[PDB]
Amino acid sequence: ETCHFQAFWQALDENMDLLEGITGFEDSVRKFICHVVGITYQHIDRWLLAEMLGDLTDSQLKMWMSKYGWSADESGQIFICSQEESIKPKNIVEKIDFDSVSSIMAS
Amino acid sequence: QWLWDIIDEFIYQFQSFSQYRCKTAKKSEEEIDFLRSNPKIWNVHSVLNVLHSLVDKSNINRQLEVYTSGGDPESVAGEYGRHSLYKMLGYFSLVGLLRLHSLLGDYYQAIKVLENIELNKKSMYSRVPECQVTTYYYVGFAYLMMRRYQDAIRVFANILLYIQRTKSMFQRTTYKYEMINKQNEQMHALLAIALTMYPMRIDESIHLQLREKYGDKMLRMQKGDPQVYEELFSYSCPKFLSPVVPNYDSVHPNYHKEPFLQQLKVFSDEVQQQAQLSTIRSFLKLYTTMPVAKLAGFLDLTEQEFRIQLLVFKHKMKNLVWTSGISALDGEFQSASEVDFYIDKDMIHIADTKVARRYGDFFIRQIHKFEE
Amino acid sequence: RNTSKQQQQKHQYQQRRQQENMQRQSRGEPPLPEEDLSKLFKPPQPPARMDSLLIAGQINTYCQNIKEFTAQNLGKLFMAQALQEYNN
Amino acid sequence: YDLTTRIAHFLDRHLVFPLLEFLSVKEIYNEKELLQGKLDLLSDTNMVDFAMDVYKNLYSDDIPHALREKRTTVVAQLKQLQAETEPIVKMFEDPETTRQMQSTRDGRMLFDYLADKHGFRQEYLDTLYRYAKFQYECGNYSGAAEYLYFFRVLVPATDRNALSSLWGKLASEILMQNWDAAMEDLTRLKETIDNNSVSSPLQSLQQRTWLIHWSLFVFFNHPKGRDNIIDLFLYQPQYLNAIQTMCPHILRYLTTAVITNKDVRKRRQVLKDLVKVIQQESYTYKDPITEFVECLYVNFDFDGAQKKLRECESVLVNDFFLVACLEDFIENARLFIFETFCRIHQCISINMLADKLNMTPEEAERWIVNLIRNARLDAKIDSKLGHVVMGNNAVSPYQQVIEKTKSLSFRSQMLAMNI
């Protein structure tokens, strides 16, 4: 909840039976981490993505990276979202007030 | 003696009224159209349903504090009274909304929130102003419990401002009007602490000498306090659950205490986590774009000694507050800074000044109609 | 506003001090008058109801509100026409 | 002011035990040396501060004064003079006098323990009165005076003897460094000045000066003493008129003790009611280092001011006076002038601050970030020109007027619609 994924991976009881028996827990936790990355990073480092998702080797890292369609980028990053895409401010680009305001002010 | 005994007298009346209500009101149009045609007053019916909910809630809290495990009140209220009144037809008028408003207010106090998707979808009747205010009061608390600060503040602002075009009159507010207004204010202040810098939209609902007082507290809380959080927590938890009434302090009972201890923990852990995020949200986005030295000055601001700065900076950024691009090659961190705007409220104010003059024109003309 | 304040300072402010004083004096003398009680209360020039100024005032403020309304109506349609011509 | 007309006939005819003479022909920082001389006379000889006076610049002439009192500690003054090699041949008073004092303490000490043990009310007062002469005659014997003043203090002629005893215990234990006793009599003195005594002109003035002497030097919580002294007798920067006022120095400490313990909102009143009142107008043209701080602040200069304040730091860091909070004063002087400057500013280059104060531009940037971090400055920082830019030009005042005018009147009409 406080987004300390690296601390979560380092503090998890590996041999607990109950953790194994939750069908699809492992993909679901990584999907949450990838969702936080996909909203909030335009580009991410390759080591940084592996660090966040719990020590994924570059074979496993593809099974996560290509699961969200994410591209390779130069020296030596991963492309997640464009800078133009992750802005789009709803505020200020407004003042359509006049047709509504003139109608209620008409008489 | 006396106080508990009055609760039983009310329970005996409410159970008897429920037995009558469960019995008649699926056939009795003979009883009902005799009630529709004969009188020349109507407002009493709205008052009795609201008054019963307030008295029942006052009665339930006292029983629940004294008997803290395994006793009747929640099930007997839930299964028989609240579910039967929820599941039968609404009397034609806003009476079905009034029964739903108690059910929602009981559901809110038992913290069993989810069913608002069902409740809203069955509430397709016209929101005549009082039933708008009641609906907004519960919806603002539901958004607050959902942790939707942006949505909760708009709903709370409407009922705190109180310009909802209510016309009551006939004691319907009632007996807690001041307390209900402060209950909205208290949550609105908590929401303002989370959201500010961005509003710009507190001036409508909270008058300046309270914008001043919560502003001192908000700036101090995100710089050092402890005591503002302690003050904010102690006033707020008192108003968050809406328990209506306490009992009476003494050495001998535990009971109420077990009550209070459960309430304090549940609000504490969530508000503590949210308060830490509010402090992270404190530092201004002074420029969009940071090369390594500016990032290092942000790390120095963030934490020191030494070990582990950048690691916790990843977590602090990814709580919600920073959406950004990184270049490994150029060494530059690239972010946006969020923006907001003003001269919004005035467009609403021009409509309601027109209503305010018109309501006064109506009042003088209504008085004048008695001296014709 | 000055006319209303002048009548208020005669209606309320004089009478308030006269009752303040009359309550201090206490206000009934049994063997003979009542000399200063007889002196107390005589009308100032407005004791109430300067309607000849007030009603004529209100008719003029109503005329002023009509001028505000016609000026606002001119502004509503000028703003609409100015916005309508530019954006195509 | 009433008490000022009391001063007006008298004209600096103060009663001080050293009379007028203080350590002559002094070199460095003459206003500080002049201040030390008026303070030495008004504190009835300091003593301790003589060593401080010599430490800043080498003077021989404490020896001067230091030879002429014995009740600091006879052995200490005798060792001070024989270290110098002053060939006095006049040290014969003390073995006779001290031997009478030894017989006097022990022949009081036997009664001391009997009077405590018996507890008899006449006997305790008689033993106290028999004591009171001795502790007035020699307080060196300091703890013996403190034991006596712990209990009763008062003797038949109450006011003069109690008030002189409080000043003497406060003065002795400030010199001996017993702070708790000094803190006790700082407190006991400000309680005692209410009633008062006859209050013949000079007495009230000497009481004001004694309050300044204990409050001035800073040991523990002196900002509370700053609060107690200013609103006591109603807000003055020097507390005397009649042109010769020069204490000089208290306003410097007082301003810092507002700035580091309170909001500066608040320095607007200090500027009118302490700085521009005629007692400070008299003091300012007797202290150019104080004058530069106030005159640069009230005229809002950007680059004559900051250099002159940095020039003043160089003199102030070589002030050997007791004050405790020295760099606290200097650092918040740098912040307060910057905060005053930034109130109406458009821009500041980070470099142009740095060259001016002799600091590195990154240190200057992080210092400006600390103003922003504390909310002592609204800003944006340009990342690529290295300039901090301010913008508080507040477009649209109308709404916050509209808030108040229609909230009161509309709800007042709603209150009317019920009878």
Added chain:
Amino acid sequence: RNQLTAMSSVLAKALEVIKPAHILQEKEEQHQLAVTAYLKNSRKEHQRILARRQTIEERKERLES
């Protein structure tokens, strides 16, 4: 300035149409026919209105006085 955009938009379009436009001339010839149709009926009513109005004028003199 105030009203100028509306006035210039109406006046330029009106000048362009009024100065030489055949559709406006055709509208006017149709309008002139309608005016003549009204006027040709109106002369019949003027004759009748003379008798009504002379009767009214004489007895308005006496009734109002």
Added chain:
Amino acid sequence: YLHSRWYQARDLMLMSHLQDNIQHADPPVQILYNRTMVQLGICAFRQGLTKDAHNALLDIQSSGRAKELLGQGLLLRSLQERNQEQEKVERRRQVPFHLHINLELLECVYLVSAMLLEIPYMAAHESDARRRMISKQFHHQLRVGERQPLLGPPESMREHVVAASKAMKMGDWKTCHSFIINEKMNGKVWDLFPEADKVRTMLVRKIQEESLRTYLFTYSSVYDSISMETLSDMFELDLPTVHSIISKMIINEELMASLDQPTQTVVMHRTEPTAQQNLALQLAEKLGSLVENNERVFDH
């Protein structure tokens, strides 16, 4: 005040507190109070402090009876001045000609001091900072010469003040200096004190400061931005004085103007014609709510 230094006169007056004494100390001591009060205002003017000079003559210049104090009273000149039999005692107490003060000079000192304060004050207020008007101050004394449609060249002392007010309203500072300085050499009124050039220099600087002040108040109605070199050269002033004038104006009327002292540039953008009408209407509406709530406090 006259032969020593103006701190000592202020110190001694603020020590002494003789208000209670002058009531109970007879007409000759009251005449001495008036003699010293005139001299305190003249010495305040000789140090250039316009407020202190204006306040020190306030008791005198709110009184129409100053002519009587010097024995120059007539037995009809309002309606009260009687009887002659008492006046025979009064004219045998007040006063030798060599002990006179000139009242006509005193009026000029008070009016020039008030004019320098109140012309920026009216210019700031009626360009829409209107919030502190004082009913019966310099405006009233100006009013009797302001409303004269026939008043062109002056011969009289009051006509000079009206001419100086006409110059100060236009704002040409060299023109304002010329009217005040030349006509007081021509009238034998500069000659009187060997501090004449010191006082002229002080008045010259006050006219330079308050002409710059009125220039900024009027032209902030159109100014987006202002360079500070032009202000220094055009008002014939040093940059410390110009920075000092502008910063105090922004800081103590609390103006939303961004001053750059390093780049010598002021940015503001306060415009407008409509905004001024909006502020005037909002003041008029505020005086509606204030009266609306005054009527309630009369009622209850």
